Amino acid sequence: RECISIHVGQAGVQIGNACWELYCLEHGIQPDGQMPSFNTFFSETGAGKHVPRAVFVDLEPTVIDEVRTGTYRQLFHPEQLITGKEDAANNYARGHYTIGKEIIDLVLDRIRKLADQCTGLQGFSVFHSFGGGTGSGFTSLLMERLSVDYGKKSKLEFSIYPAPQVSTAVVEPYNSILTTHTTLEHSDCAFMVDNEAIYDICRRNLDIERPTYTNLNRLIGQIVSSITASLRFDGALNVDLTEFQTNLVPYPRGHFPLATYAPVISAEKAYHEQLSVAEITNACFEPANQMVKCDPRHGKYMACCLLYRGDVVPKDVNAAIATIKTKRTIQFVDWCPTGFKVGINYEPPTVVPGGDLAKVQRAVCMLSNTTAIAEAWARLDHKFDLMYAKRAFVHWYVGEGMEEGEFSEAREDMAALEKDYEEVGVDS
Amino acid sequence: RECISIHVGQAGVQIGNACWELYCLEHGIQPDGQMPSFNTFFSETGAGKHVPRAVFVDLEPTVIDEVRTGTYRQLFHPEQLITGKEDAANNYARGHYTIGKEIIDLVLDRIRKLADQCTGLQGFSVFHSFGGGTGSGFTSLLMERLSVDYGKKSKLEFSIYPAPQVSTAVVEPYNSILTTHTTLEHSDCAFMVDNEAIYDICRRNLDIERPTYTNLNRLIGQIVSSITASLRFDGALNVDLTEFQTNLVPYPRGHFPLATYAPVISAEKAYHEQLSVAEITNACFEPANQMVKCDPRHGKYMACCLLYRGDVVPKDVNAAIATIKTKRTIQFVDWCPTGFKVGINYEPPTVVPGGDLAKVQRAVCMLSNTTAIAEAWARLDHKFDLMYAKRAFVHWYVGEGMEEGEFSEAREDMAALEKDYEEVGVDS
Amino acid sequence: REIVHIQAGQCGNQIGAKFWEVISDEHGIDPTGSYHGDSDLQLERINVYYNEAAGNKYVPRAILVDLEPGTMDSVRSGPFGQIFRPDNFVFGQSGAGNNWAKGHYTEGAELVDSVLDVVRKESESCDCLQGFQLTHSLGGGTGSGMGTLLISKIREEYPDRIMNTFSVVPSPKVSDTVVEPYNATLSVHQLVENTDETYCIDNEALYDICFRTLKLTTPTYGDLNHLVSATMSGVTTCLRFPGQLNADLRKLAVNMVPFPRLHFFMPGFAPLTSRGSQQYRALTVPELTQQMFDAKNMMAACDPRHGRYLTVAAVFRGRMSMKEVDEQMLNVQNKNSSYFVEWIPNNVKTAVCDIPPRGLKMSATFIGNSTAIQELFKRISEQFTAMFRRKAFLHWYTGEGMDEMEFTEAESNMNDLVSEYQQYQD
Amino acid sequence: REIVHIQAGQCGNQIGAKFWEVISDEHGIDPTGSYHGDSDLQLERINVYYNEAAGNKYVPRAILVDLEPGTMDSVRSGPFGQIFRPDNFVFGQSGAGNNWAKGHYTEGAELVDSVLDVVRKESESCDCLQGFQLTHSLGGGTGSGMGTLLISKIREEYPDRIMNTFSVVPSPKVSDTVVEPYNATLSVHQLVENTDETYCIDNEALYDICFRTLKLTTPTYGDLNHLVSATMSGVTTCLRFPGQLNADLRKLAVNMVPFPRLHFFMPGFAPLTSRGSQQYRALTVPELTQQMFDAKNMMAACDPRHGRYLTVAAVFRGRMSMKEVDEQMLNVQNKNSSYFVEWIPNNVKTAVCDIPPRGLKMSATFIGNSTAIQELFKRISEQFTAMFRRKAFLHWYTGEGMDEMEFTEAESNMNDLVSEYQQYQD
Amino acid sequence: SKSNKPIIHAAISHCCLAGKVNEPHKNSILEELEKCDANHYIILFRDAGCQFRALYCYYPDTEEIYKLTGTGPKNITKKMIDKLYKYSSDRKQFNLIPAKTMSVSVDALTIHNHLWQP
Ligand SMILES: CC(=O)O[C@H]1C(=O)[C@@]2(C)[C@H]([C@H](OC(=O)c3ccccc3)[C@]3(O)C[C@H](OC(=O)[C@H](O)[C@@H](NC(=O)c4ccccc4)c4ccccc4)C(C)=C1C3(C)C)[C@]1(OC(C)=O)CO[C@@H]1C[C@@H]2O
Ligand SMILES: CC(=O)O[C@H]1C(=O)[C@@]2(C)[C@H]([C@H](OC(=O)c3ccccc3)[C@]3(O)C[C@H](OC(=O)[C@H](O)[C@@H](NC(=O)c4ccccc4)c4ccccc4)C(C)=C1C3(C)C)[C@]1(OC(C)=O)CO[C@@H]1C[C@@H]2O
Ligand SMILES: Nc1nc2c(ncn2[C@@H]2O[C@H](COP(=O)(O)OP(=O)(O)OP(=O)(O)O)[C@@H](O)[C@H]2O)c(=O)[nH]1
Ligand SMILES: Nc1nc2c(ncn2[C@@H]2O[C@H](COP(=O)(O)OP(=O)(O)OP(=O)(O)O)[C@@H](O)[C@H]2O)c(=O)[nH]1
Ligand SMILES: Nc1nc2c(ncn2[C@@H]2O[C@H](COP(=O)(O)OP(=O)(O)O)[C@@H](O)[C@H]2O)c(=O)[nH]1
Ligand SMILES: [Mg+2]
Ligand SMILES: [Mg+2]
């Protein structure tokens, strides 16, 4: 009946700064822990004040310093404030092997304390990136050790994937190759988040021309709050996370879902707005609302999970599914005939005090498995290829004891990864 | 039960500024969208506010700037506000091909959103001109694509036709030749509007000596509102738009109707007035109220559709039809003996708050198909002939990808157009 | 939809200084760049001319071109120079001294690349350009010669934009050097192929306009340019301000030009009247068109009743009725159809601006192309025939490194232009 | 995460004196060490630079290195020397007199061990070592020659830290002695093996920057170093102050260095403008990146349009939006992919600091590596070819006890340094 | 008639083939542009990073796609094209075009990655 949010890397904290702020919005929670009634994301003491069941990972003090000196610091317990002293220097090797190995003895036992607090552990969720130093190396180290400890629990990664055009660091393809093998080796479900597609959403569906990482993640955490707590909360058709291990990935190694969410309505758009259930689902099939720069038109659809909020009539849902079959440009696969699992929440979606998202009376989250995702991995592939051709950047990892054959190994792990999603689309 | 108004070009937006002002006058609609009850031109949201099912087309910001910053901007949603950034430069080649092709993928998909909102799509109506840049080039591009998308829908153009004496731009005959072929290739019904005859109406039937484009279009949109919404509204003899595809053009390519409307009464003419139904119909056969400078006296009449408003007695209508047969100077054709389709609205006509049109108790709209229209095309023909004889203005279109043989092609298209309407009058 | 105004020479820098004097006064703008106007019309279309800076400051998107600071020294020390940035003050030492071959071919080209780079600095800062505006003299050495290399480079850079310059036509009466018609001869040889259009301005015509119609006593060059700038502002503000017949210049360039080399225009300004005739003359729409039609309102010394009108543009300003506009437009065509071409039914293009100017209730701007403009061109050529034979002070241009047949090729290209107007004349 | 700043020579002691002038002014600190700032940002990261003493006094973690008191005599008698403890004033008698062999090999090493113990005194007093900072000249005999032994011993002590120095590149125009290119030659032969990175500073390039863009009249060396210190402060305060793209220098050293020997960097500073263009220039993100991209904003006399960029670091300061940052970063790559390497899709590393500096709302710091930096090395080497043959005043260095093939070994290492840029050039 | 020839000459001379290192490259190319009779010139690109690969002489009719100058294939099918490019003069940069029939208004393109040989 409980789970854990894990925040590894600078980004995963910065996302969770909005996420747990939205989690305060779930019940109108005061920043001390006072709330009238719910114990799934929280731990309740005798004082009636609730602390999050969360994990804060950083090898620098700096991002933690904004946490421990800002708002909501009375909500957070200093056990969960886990900080480091020396940076990973944006390295996989210092993330996975060198620096994090003297911190992991602290980090794993903090979870085991919090796992001891839980009654009916369903699993946990991890927030990080693919190409980071902390959120790639240490995440590869963390997800390995948690799989050793808790083999039969949920393992969730909602990961940030770098854009093919915009990369804030050069080694972001060079770090993501080694990350992805151990990601596929351990994780049960791994999402991909591309800021470049979200940039197109803000400038068009919200018409916002000055976003920061704040304005990006408030969109993202609103989706995840509908993903996590809303499926935990009561509705008309209640689905849990374990059925996503059932009805979303029918494969041993296939778990890279594509998540969309398309009520994205600016406040000026809101006064002229009549959006039914089916009208949002057509926007979920639009390329402008895919959250990853991709072309799902050329991708075969494997699984489609629908997650609804608020005003839901199930007969209107059946017309929305009938809308999907009629407007077919989708090339849906023949292996599963009609696997379209529905999720219905009775609760209305929430509005950020201070955000730029208008009040709607229905919100729709759609999970998708499409074959065009490997083309983004194919973009990531040649970035690793040309750098390995010149053997650039190799001396930072040779000095840390990493083998050059491991690079071509993980490339073959990336190649066999690209072989696997090709086998879905090619075979029929 | 719904249709779309399309406004392509600088003029068609300026007409529609009066049209939707009259459409607010159809129910006393407040500028927020508040109206007590009707959903044909409108989409109703949950807030009880109605938005127009309209299309606003411009490649300049400027005409849209008056729309989005004036009155009724709380009625319009910026989905319909489609603007460009570079002008078509009054060019067909930039209108039909060069500039508008980067916007047409936006514009067609805006229609498909709004066509998805409709239940019982009956068709649409387009407002443009013959000799414009946007309203001739991009109209030829848009009506082509909509005919591909929606083959079995209504396609209406109420187009402005230039005077033989008054022309605002020199290329207005030079643009209208290429427009007219693709107009005949796609459109279901195309009207011709000449401002010069409307100038004679204002100075005589209203005695107004200072008109603008506002004062012209208030007359025109009052007719179109009686054409479009009044046939959608309840009356005594109710005809829909689809029967005008039946009982107005018995031809594959014959759809250039002539429209008249002659209760045109000034406020001082209102007290020297006792006008029956038949007395208006005699004014409908007058040369001073034809809306196009032509001589219908030398033209053979193919079809005569009658559209009435307000105080109608059908027995008195039958005497008015008998008045037509008695006063014969009309040279009515022998192919159809007595095809005079009648339209009766029970609703009274409206009066613009701010206009100069008096309150009548009966309003009469008459459609006509006559053979003297090709004489205006014959005036347009030699205008194209003398320019092509000198090969004047040729480098603006050959420099943009047009062929000089296409000019003589569309002239032969214009000639065969003049051959077709000659075959109606000559053959008996 | 933005415009850059490249002012050149001792003349056109002084000339276009009056232009931005008008426009900053038009929109209610402080001399230092602050906004003080009261209309959204003066607030929305700032983008076309000015670059918004910090503190509600509007930067003139316009570069002054000279080989000497002294002209710009007068502008910077004078009024409205305080809004100009030092990036637009591009200068060298020394000047050419009214010599076409020095700035175009030998010396000014070093300063040209410094000019063009700042153009590249500003054109990248824009949202979307519509064209580049210029002003100089035909017989101006630094005015035309520098600009003739500029337009050759800008058209090489930007073929997609309108290339217009504002040219001072050499008066047969007013000359300071004798090699002044040499400079206009070498200009038009590249002005035809590189520019999209230009306008024709003669001070000799404007002397009559200030005196015969306005009864002015002592006009300056700026007093002439005070008239020029209103004709300058009458063209392009209709592209900016709203209106019913909103006509682009690129729309106007299509209608006013039947043949791509025939792009030399006759500007005119209709509401010309003195102070004493204010109490005698009513302001109507036919009142302005009668002064549109008159020969004594043209900015070039040509007889329009001698030549024949090719194309006519009718730019109007104010609150007018379309019936009164079109009927008065039609009656001029009804009256003097001998003054027109045969093969066009409507040689007059109407341009109604709904937005009025300040002071007057109505205004109008005449733009025409006629066959009579060859008259001033024959004044160029017939002087050029005698001057080429004797080669008077040719060794100045000869030491710069130019060829005599290049002059003859420029002469033959000028001899083309004499033949070009006659073939559509009758 | 603390930093020691080792300033050396007559130059870099004077140069880095401007640096702590900035930082003490940056955080609101009294000249005697008292705190008077108002932000917790200025209160939290004092540890990285300063050592907190009793009475709210902040000891600069920085040592001035010279064989002469006179430079430190100017600092101690001047402003901001009062915050310095007497332990950091290490000096002897006499100076080398601009001789590399005297400080490194014969004489200065006796004073070096006295310095390094005080380094061991302060680094043990630190909480966590991050890296040691240096600044001198390449042609500085006591500046580099002492430091070449210092970097050799510190790397022998602390391999785990970053070794960076701020070197003055010898200008081809500015020379006081003739054996000045000898000193830069013998430096880099040990700088490549011992330093992790360095920055390139040429006063000859800065003379253009003060004059062509800033329009300054009489620049001093401190006026030069006033520009240098802002580029110095732009680097490491982003490691200190919060931000979204908080990038370590050790993070930066991984991305900016593809080949371990090639770690020579081209610094730049974007918001460069004079007082006249303050009222005339808008403060935007594309405004600064255009001056990031300009060749005339580089602190070293190189043509970046001649060579090709290896790696680019984009340090930003102020309250900016990520979308405007990432697009404007991308558009430079979209325009000038010829200026880059082939085998990397994104040569530009962005470093957005949320914390703004004082005075300006936006600021930025350009760091680049290109193939054009070998141009100044060929200016070193070709002068070194002529000077080695005639052996002019070689007997000064010969009597100190150095070998001629050691110069050739330094030359061959310098010759390979020319080749290592070319093999990745095209 | 219509011609992209000065604009393509304006495209490489300021954006693509800029630099003193590309000056031996473009001097071979500018004379080659004067040689060909086609009014329609198309530049080849590998990716959207705008890296100059080759130059083509495409025409909207069935005239040759033929590789004029640069590294690439000789023959490119209309199936092989992926993304169509144009050049805004004022931005001195490129802009994206939606998928359509290619003609004179198109200035450059990119093609498929498996068509590129390793
Ligand atoms: C008391 C009063 O208002 O008198 C008028 C005036 O009577 C007359 C004589 C004005 C006056 O103009 C001249 O005397 C004049 C002389 C040489 C060259 C140009 C002008 C006036 O200066 C000109 C001025 O016009 C304007 O301000 C227009 O808006 C004009 N702007 C400028 O020329 C201008 C003046 C000063 C500073 C900046 C700009 C304009 C024209 C076209 C497009 C935009 C703006 C006006 C109304 C007046 C005076 C003061 C006498 C006239 O001109 C204009 C342009 O309106 C000359 O023919 C008209 C007839 C006017 O009646
Ligand atoms: C009235 C006023 O405020 O004037 C400004 C000013 O106008 C200009 C001209 C300043 C001024 O700088 C110079 O003139 C200058 C000359 C040579 C070398 C270095 C600087 C200014 O001195 C510099 C100074 O900048 C700062 O103080 C920054 O915080 C800067 N700090 C210092 O340089 C500094 C100065 C004195 C003592 C201690 C530090 C900084 C820069 C980067 C990182 C941290 C701090 C400011 C705002 C001004 C003046 C006084 C004129 C400029 O510089 C900076 C660094 O901001 C030059 O380009 C900018 C543009 C500014 O507009
Ligand atoms: N959407 C989003 N992306 C972020 C945010 N913060 C950082 N990123 C992205 O994360 C990537 C950089 O990751 P880092 O923060 O440096 O990696 P890390 O896991 O913290 O590890 P270190 O490199 O050791 O600091 C880039 O792609 C950034 O765009 C954020 O708040 N939101
Ligand atoms: N009756 C009427 N005619 C108008 C109106 N506005 C313009 N016109 C006519 O439209 C014609 C000119 O067409 P334009 O509107 O300029 O051309 P366009 O199709 O809008 O597109 P562009 O030329 O590319 O700007 C002339 O015959 C004008 O008389 C209007 O409001 N009413
Ligand atoms: N109307 C007008 N004519 C001018 C002005 N300045 C110069 N001229 C005329 O233009 C010619 C000289 O042009 P100038 O600008 O000095 O040439 P340049 O500087 O060598 O290019 C002569 O015929 C002058 O009478 C001016 O401000 N206004
Ligand atoms: Mg990290
Ligand atoms: Mg238009």
3-state secondary structure string, B116-182? HHCCCEEEEEEEEECCCCHHHHHHHHHHHHHHHHCCCCEEEEEEECCCCCCCCCCCHHHHHHHHHHH
Strand ranges of the sheet holding A340-344, from the earlier edge strand across to the other edge: A258-261, A362-370, A301-310, A340-344
Q: How far is the CA of C388 from the centre of ligand 2 (A)?
A: 61
Residue E45 pairs with which residues in a beta bridge?
Answer: E52, E110
Which of A274, A279, A282 has its CB closest to that of B46? A274
Contacts by C335-344, CB closer than 8 A, 24 or more apart: C336/C293, C338/C308, C339/C304, C339/C305, C339/C308, C339/C309, C340/C308, C340/C309, C341/C308, C341/C309, C341/C310, C341/C424, C342/B386, C343/B386, C343/B387, C343/B389, C343/B390, C343/B392, C344/B170, C344/B386, C344/B387, C344/B392, C344/C311
* Axis crossing angle, helix D69-77 with helix D9-26, rounded to the nearest 10: 20
Nearest CA in chain C to B385: C343
Query: Is residue E44 assigned to a domain?
Result: yes
Name the domain boundary from B246, B275, B300.
Answer: B246
**B139 and B226 together in one domain:** yes
Ligand 2 atom index nearest CA of D358: 29
Q: Is A122 left (phi over 0), alpha (psi -120 to 50) or beta?
A: alpha
CATH number of the structural domain spanning residue E38: 3.10.20.360
Beta strands in D68-161 (DSSP E): 89-90, 129-137
Query: Is residue A287 assigned to a domain?
Result: yes
| Residue burial A168-204, b: 16+ Cβ < 10 Å; e: rest | bbbbbbbbbbbbbbbbbebbbbbbbbbbbbbbbbbee
Are C and A close enough to touch, i.e. 3+ CB pairs under 8 angstroms?
A: no
**B357 and B323 together in one domain:** yes
* E114: nearest Cα among B43, C162, A418, C36: A418
**A149 and A40 together in one domain:** yes
Are B357 and B265 contacting, i.e. CB atoms less than 8 angstroms apart? yes
Q: How far is the CA of D400 from the centre of ligand 7 (A)?
A: 87
- Of all protein residues, the one whose alpha carbon is nearest to atom 29 of ligand 4 is B168
CA terminus-to-terminus distance, chain A: 39
* B407: nearest Cα among B390, B385, B377, B380: B385
As given in the structure block, the two tokens for residue A410 are: 């993980």
Residues of B catalogued as catalytic: 243
Does C219 sit in the ligand 1 pocket, CB within 6 Å? no
| D331 labeled binding residue | no
Query: Is residue E116 assigned to a domain?
Result: no
**A240 and A272 together in one domain:** no
Query: Is residue E90 assigned to a domain?
Result: yes
As given in the structure block, the two tokens for residue B238 are: 């109710």
**A295 and A330 together in one domain:** yes
As given in the structure block, the two tokens for residue C352 are: 């109604």
Q: How far is the CA of D115 from the centre of ligand 4 (A)?
A: 85
Which of A167, A390, A395 has its CB closest to that of D260? A395
Domains of chain C from N-terminus onward: 1-258 (3.40.50.1440), 259-372 (3.30.1330.20), 373-426 (1.10.287.600)
What 3-state class would DSSP assign to B332? strand
* C19: nearest Cα among C172, C190, C188, C233: C233
Tell which one of C245, C250, C327 to mutate to probe ligand 4, the residue whose CB is within 8 A of the most ligand atoms: C245
Tell me the C-alpha distance between D234 and D230, whole Å. Answer: 6
Tell me the C-alpha distance between C135 and C126, whole Å. Answer: 21
Ligand 5 atom index nearest CA of C143: 21
Tell me the C-alpha distance between B313 and A382, whole Å. Answer: 81
Nearest CA in chain D to C55: D279
What 3-state class would DSSP assign to B346? coil
Instruction: State which residues have CB under 5 angstroms from ligand 7, the bound ion.
Output: B 9-10, 134
Write out residues with Cβ below 6 Å of ligand 2. Answer: D 21-22, 25-26, 223, 226-227, 230, 233-234, 271-273, 275, 278, 357-360, 363
As given in the structure block, the two tokens for residue A315 are: 């007969």
DSSP assignment of D54-78 equals TTTEEEE-EEEE-S-HHHHHHHHHS
**B231 and B268 together in one domain:** no
Tell me the C-alpha distance between A16 and A218, whole Å. Answer: 10
D94: cis peptide before it, omega within 30°? Answer: yes
Ligand 3 atom index nearest CA of A135: 19
Ligand 2 atom index nearest CA of D234: 43
Are B344 and B236 contacting, i.e. CB atoms less than 8 angstroms apart? yes
Query: Is residue B251 assigned to a domain?
Result: no
As given in the structure block, the two tokens for residue A305 are: 């999970």
What 3-state class would DSSP assign to A20? helix
Query: Is residue B252 assigned to a domain?
Result: no
**A212 and A288 together in one domain:** no
- Of all protein residues, the one whose alpha carbon is nearest to atom 2 of ligand 2 is D359
**A136 and A60 together in one domain:** yes
**A156 and A231 together in one domain:** yes
Residues of D in contact with E50 (CB under 8 A): 333-335, 337
CATH number of the structural domain spanning residue B119: 3.40.50.1440
**B98 and B193 together in one domain:** yes
The structural domain count of chain B equals 3
CATH number of the structural domain spanning residue A392: 1.10.287.600
What phi, psi does B158 have (nearest 5°)? -110, 95
Tell me the C-alpha distance between D27 and D37, whole Å. Answer: 6
Are C411 and C185 contacting, i.e. CB atoms less than 8 angstroms apart? yes
Identity of residue C195: T
Are D16 and D75 contacting, i.e. CB atoms less than 8 angstroms apart? no
Are A304 and A333 contacting, i.e. CB atoms less than 8 angstroms apart? no
Identity of residue B214: T
**A351 and A306 together in one domain:** yes
Does C226 sit in the ligand 1 pocket, CB within 6 Å? yes
Query: Is residue B368 assigned to a domain?
Result: yes
- Of all protein residues, the one whose alpha carbon is nearest to atom 10 of ligand 3 is A11
Q: How far is the CA of D124 from the centre of ligand 6 (A)?
A: 27
Give D358's contacts (C-beta < 8 A, 6+ positions apart).
Answer: D26
Beta strands in A9-61 (DSSP E): 42-44, 50-52, 54-57
| Residue burial D86-123, b: 16+ Cβ < 10 Å; e: rest | eebbbbeeebbebbbbbbbbebbeebbeebbeebeebb
**B385 and B360 together in one domain:** no
Q: Do C57 and D283 touch (CB under 8 A)?
A: no
The alpha-carbon radius of gyration of chain E (Å, integer) is 13
Give B181's contacts (C-beta < 8 A, 6+ positions apart).
Answer: B409, B410, B413, B414
Total beta-carbon pairs less than 8 A apart between chain A and chain B = 18
Ligand whose nearest atom lies closest to the CA of A92: 3
Print the SS3 string covering D261-287.
CCCEEEEEECCCCCCHHHCCCCCCHHH
* Axis crossing angle, helix C221-240 with helix C249-256, rounded to the nearest 10: 100
Residues of D in contact with C121 (CB under 8 A): 290
Tell which one of B13, B19, B160, B293 to mutate to probe ligand 4, the residue whose CB is within 8 A of the most ligand atoms: B160
Are A57 and A6 contacting, i.e. CB atoms less than 8 angstroms apart? yes
* Elucidation technique: cryo-EM
Strand ranges of the sheet holding E42-45, from the earlier edge strand across to the other edge: E67-70, E52-56, E42-45, E108-111, E81-88, E93-97
Query: Is residue B107 assigned to a domain?
Result: yes
Tell me the C-alpha distance between B321 and D316, whole Å. Answer: 83
Ligand whose nearest atom lies closest to the CA of D317: 2
| D12 labeled binding residue | no
Which of A14, A89, A393 has its CB closest to that of D258? A393
The structural domain count of chain E equals 1
Range of the domain at B296: 258-374
Identity of residue E85: Y
As given in the structure block, the two tokens for residue D204 are: 């000859």
What 3-state class would DSSP assign to E43? strand
Maximum C-alpha span of chain C: 63
Ligand whose nearest atom lies closest to the CA of D23: 2
Q: Do B401 and E2 touch (CB under 8 A)?
A: yes
Nearest CA in chain D to E17: D338
What phi, psi does D376 have (nearest 5°)? -70, -30
